[PDB]
């Protein structure tokens, strides 16, 4: 039949792609072009728009598979061809060797980091049930599509996944469907060495619902039955078991050795020959398949067809509604939002920076309907809801509505990583964080550094970011975790000193379409400083104490800031003049031009860093560094200030020893460099 | 009774702890007191001597019910006093405001970040299981100890926890028991709100045994009958649910509020006159009390004292084994150990750093017993399994047996790095290890940060360090990797070069006592360097090429060190001369004494770095940096060096501006510093 000519194209193409780089996998792919095959004639989609918003998304959690994934796109019309697929990891090319969302048309995400992608399918039926809790009316199903993710045993061995299966269960997801390619084979053999856990009992204790297709090799009648089964459960996500054979087909079928390695040139010719292809051509696609693929593709587009002229019809009958979902659409945040960041004066009392972010969200969230975030179980101390919101819960519970904007992650601060990219990916303008201690946005490495390379713009709220918590102690205390994000391209890094700056790191924040915000934030008062404005601090690095005649300039960031002005007046008592940088953002102010950043980092003088952890990174910006290269201690926080030295004669004394050191050289920016 | 007036004692020891401190958490440790009581009358430890190597092990996971801990080490007579818990959560004290192993005595590992704590129980039963299968003998049960976890809520929420949980599930870890504190609050108020999940059918498909305690606040029979009847399940980890009320007793109880904040001065009026304790009165320790744990106490170091006859006995009867256990229980590797590091010489051909370890282990496993270790599913390109030992498994799989020494950890990197920390704590001289890729090292950043802060000689086997690896592109290659880890205090990073350095590093790493190491190697194929030697790579960092009148000395680790000599030849033919220097471990190299580096790193000369990874850190050791500050990208790997300059001539032509940057400049050593 033309499906099972569309099952053996799919198959030999990610074959062939492999074969012609020499490097991939070819095992899944072989094991899941069926179900590829029958969730990709089931899914709404357009290969001419990929961005629709009410489109089905499809994700491939295991990466590694993505010559699947690339072969679909390509017989699919999709803005990718055999000729990319040739290309298959090779350098600069359409097809890299995991899929990335920012270079693959029709790749929703970055996956290959083993389960992120199924928490990424998690975020975007999350988002999914929030965007159509927010817009549909009666006759005006705006939103109602589907997430479909295919997973293998490696995904489901990382914990975020469990993170994420239990919350999405707990959140009653029923547009989310996954399938496990249960192929009872990993990279170190079978799952009988380490993975035989009952996987279908611990998605029942989830809430989930299971279909199981017994013969996922040829029965894509059954996989279709699944996920017609999948659809009329509304309340609970479903996991689909796909029972495959790794590598079906070739000689080494159902072996490790399929798994993560090119076939051998003969096993790809009984391929061919066993399934009817050319054994001497690579690359083919039948015109009959191509005929099959562009039937559904005209399909998609009449069903897009209509569902822009019921959005016309929408803004007529809801027009304040409709103009905003339009903007969102467009990419745009309402105008003039900014207006609704606090702003504070010198004459204002000191306020935690984790207190001035609560009031900033208090304050945005009413006016840009696109926010929505939450915490992983640290609510009442990150300060992350705003008063009168109400949480994102199955209206079922009792504790919320899928209309609400306040997530409670639950303690998965991985799992809401993921979460937050997938709902950046869902698109539609969200702006979307998560709140939790900035040690323990650690938890989440994994799916932080894929915000940083899908270009996501999401936001994480890190509060007690310092030894300024206290008695919690070292366990608790980040010491190296702002050198590990600032090394990371692509991630803005907020520290900010003081109301205005955090109301300037907000800005950026939500501004944001494609860098990732962490905003470190204090459990501990601050004072309001003299000189700091939104203004200035949106440049990143700015001079916040301005001395011509300066003998040393003090650089300094979030809690330091302040410690560095108190420096200044101890300072001028011993007869040396100091200028103040405050730099809340390091990525921000790397990108502003190279004139400006001299002017804030000039020739001719010493700098001096001050910043209460690792002294990593901060060479770009000054001569001398004081930080804390140690772990912390369990304290009253000032007393452990003390204990450091980071008072204002400490910071004294190693300034002037910073004058001292340099007397007689020759001095140029840290901003300098041979090359 | 006097079982009843305890665990009044306990309850109110830790609220007065709580109470003096004016911070920490109470609601767990009053929920919890009776259970702790129960557990520690039928646990064998001995307060006078916390490394006896047949103690049962208790494991607080959820940390911050530490005064609970606290309490319990103070009655029993431990090193810690009432004087002690008089000072919990200050500054200095012996009372922190989470456990930690390096300060608290009977504190096995250090919890506090949640999810931790039971995954290091995991790794101290598999320790356990291990040890004994090595040592016992019949009519010699020299290790027979079980391993006792506390955890709560939020515990069962991290995905670190699901990891180790199924893998001790697979592994049949049958004197592993774990209590659960049912207690439906965590710090967003109910579980209800995130945490619906039926927690007995996820443990159940693990491969769990199940207790249910449903009266802990009072039923310590229930409790105690629990333990006998877990210690009857001889092949399944049990998990005892203890059905509490947070806060029990307390005027709040049952209430988010009681998680994490001191109760009200007539609250605690109000408990103490319903247990029969004076108002007036904190820190009251009833002598019938101290009497009746006394006598578990004598008892206890009755069966140590018959457990040392039982050694020297069991010295009489296996000579060779009885030293070996000897010499382990005394801290000490063998003698000569290290003659089994392989040696290389220019001569010899180039191998990856990968495959050099892999022949490292070949040699070194069947000299030094207490090496164990293993991959999260990468064996076969970690290469850290040696060719003819058996995997740790039990034997009714037919997998393996617990005598084995090479653990699949599956896909579960957090889970591998915490349960190492729980196998370094075990104690024995156990020297462990554990593979996967260096990027994923990342997943298990949490545990990472414990080791360190620990003082755990774990070692990480991570391969495929840089771009080098190539085709899987930029979600696999690490570029934020070391920065992150050197930031972090106390971790030895190690980068090996060659053949002789990667026998340096393996040095380092297994004689390790209070120090963490991450062994970051190659992919693809290294020269043997001219000039490398085990001697002078164990220094951390060393002259490679000598040249006195050096125009610039070259820096640089790993596979950038072949980089440099090729450059320096380059070089030459501009009429620059330079010296290269190999970086091995930045931590070793910064214990070397101040001359010893300054012979390194001298003034009088500009020094430029070259690594393949962020430039952030090498400004201690450099005044120009050459690093990759990018992502990387998906294509062969040399052709991905090509395109980032990390070439001999792209390096020279860094090299070169360097030299003309510094003309006329007066340039000291960047180990110089005014403070
Ligand atoms: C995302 C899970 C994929 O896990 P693996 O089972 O290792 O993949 P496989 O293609 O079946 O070898
Ligand atoms: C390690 C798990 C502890 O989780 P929580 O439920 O948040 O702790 P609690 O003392 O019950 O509030
Ligand atoms: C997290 C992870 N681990 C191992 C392999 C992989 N692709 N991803
Ligand atoms: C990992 C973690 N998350 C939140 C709180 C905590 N103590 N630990
Ligand atoms: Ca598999
Ligand atoms: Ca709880």
Not at 182 to 198: L, M, W
Not at 514 to 535: C, D, V, W
Request: a negative charge; proline letters at 5%.
């Amino acid at each position: 039949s033309v499906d099972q000519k569309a099952i053996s194209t799919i198959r030999l193409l990610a074959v062939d792609a492999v074969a012609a780089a020499n490097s991939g996998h070819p095992g899944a792919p072989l094991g899941l072009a069926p179900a590829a095959h029958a969730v990709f004639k089931k899914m709404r989609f357009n290969p001419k728009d990929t961005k629709w918003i009410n489109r089905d998304r499809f994700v491939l959690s295991n990466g590694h598979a993505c010559a699947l994934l690339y072969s679909m796109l390509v017989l699919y019309g999709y803005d990718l061809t055999v000729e990319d697929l040739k290309k298959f990891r090779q350098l600069g090319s359409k097809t890299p060797g995991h899929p990335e969302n920012t270079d693959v048309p029709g790749a929703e995400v970055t996956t290959g980091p083993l389960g992120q992608g199924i928490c990424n399918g998690v975020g975007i039926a999350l988002a999914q049930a929030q965007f159509a809790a927010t817009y549909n009316k009666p006759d005006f199903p705006i939103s109602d599509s589907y997430t479909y993710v295919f997973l293998g045993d490696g995904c489901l061995m990382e914990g975020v996944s469990s993170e994420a299966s239990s919350l999405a269960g707990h959140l009653q997801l029923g547009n989310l469907i996954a399938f496990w390619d249960d192929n009872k084979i990993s990279i170190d053999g079978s799952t009988e060495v380490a993975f035989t856990e009952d996987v279908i009992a611990r998605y029942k204790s989830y809430g989930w619902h299971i279909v199981e297709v017994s013969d996922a090799d040829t029965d894509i009648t059954a996989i279709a039955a699944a996920i017609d089964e999948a659809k009329k459960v509304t309340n609970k996500p479903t996991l689909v078991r796909l029972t495959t054979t790794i590598g079906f087909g070739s000689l080494a079928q159902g072996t490790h050795g399929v798994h993560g390695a090119p076939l051998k040139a003969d096993d790809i010719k009984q391929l061919k020959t066993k399934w009817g292809f050319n054994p001497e051509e690579s690359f083919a696609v039948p015109a009959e398949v191509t005929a099959s693929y562009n039937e559904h593709v005209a399909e998609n587009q009449k069903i897009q067809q209509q569902w822009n002229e019921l959005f016309a019809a929408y803004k007529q009958k809801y027009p304040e509604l409709g103009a905003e979902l339009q903007r969102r659409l467009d990419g745009k945040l309402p105008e003039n939002w900014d207006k609704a960041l606090p702003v504070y004066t010198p004459a204002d009392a000191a306020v935690a920076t984790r207190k001035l972010s609560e009031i900033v969200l208090s304050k945005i969230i009413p006016e840009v309907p696109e926010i929505i975030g939450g915490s992983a179980d640290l609510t009442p101390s990150n300060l992350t809801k705003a008063k009168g919101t109400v949480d994102f819960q199955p209206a079922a519970t009792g504790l919320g509505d899928y209309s609400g904007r306040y997530i409670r992650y639950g303690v998965r601060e991985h799992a809401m990583g993921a979460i937050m990219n997938g709902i950046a990916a869902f698109g539609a303008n969200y702006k979307n964080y998560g709140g939790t201690f900035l040690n323990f946005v650690s938890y989440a490495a994994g799916a932080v550094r894929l915000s940083a390379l899908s270009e996501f713009p999401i936001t994480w709220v890190a509060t007690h970011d310092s030894i300024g918590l206290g008695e919690d102690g070292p366990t608790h205390q980040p010491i190296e975790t702002l050198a590990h994000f600032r090394a990371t391209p692509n991630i803005s890094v907020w520290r900010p000193a003081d109301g205005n700056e955090t109301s300037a790191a907000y800005k950026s924040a939500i501004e944001s379409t494609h860098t990732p915000h962490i905003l470190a934030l204090t459990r501990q008062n601050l004072p309001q400083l003299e000189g700091s404005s939104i203004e200035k601090a949106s440049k990143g690095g700015y001079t916040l104490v301005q001395q011509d005649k300066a003998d040393i300039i003090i650089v300094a960031t979030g809690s330091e800031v302040s410690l560095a002005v108190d420096a200044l007046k101890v300072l001028e008592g011993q007869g040396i003049k100091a200028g103040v940088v405050s730099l809340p953002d390091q990525l921000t102010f790397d990108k502003q031009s190279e004139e400006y950043k001299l002017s804030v980092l000039p020739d001719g003088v010493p700098i001096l860093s001050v910043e209460v952890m690792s002294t990593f990174g901060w060479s770009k910006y000054s001569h001398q560094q004081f930080g804390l290269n140690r772990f912390g201690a369990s304290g009253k926080a000032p007393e452990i200030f003390k204990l450091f030295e980071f008072t204002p004669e400490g910071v004294a004394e190693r300034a002037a020893k910073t004058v001292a050191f340099y007397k007689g050289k020759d001095v140029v920016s840290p901003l300098r460099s041979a090359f």
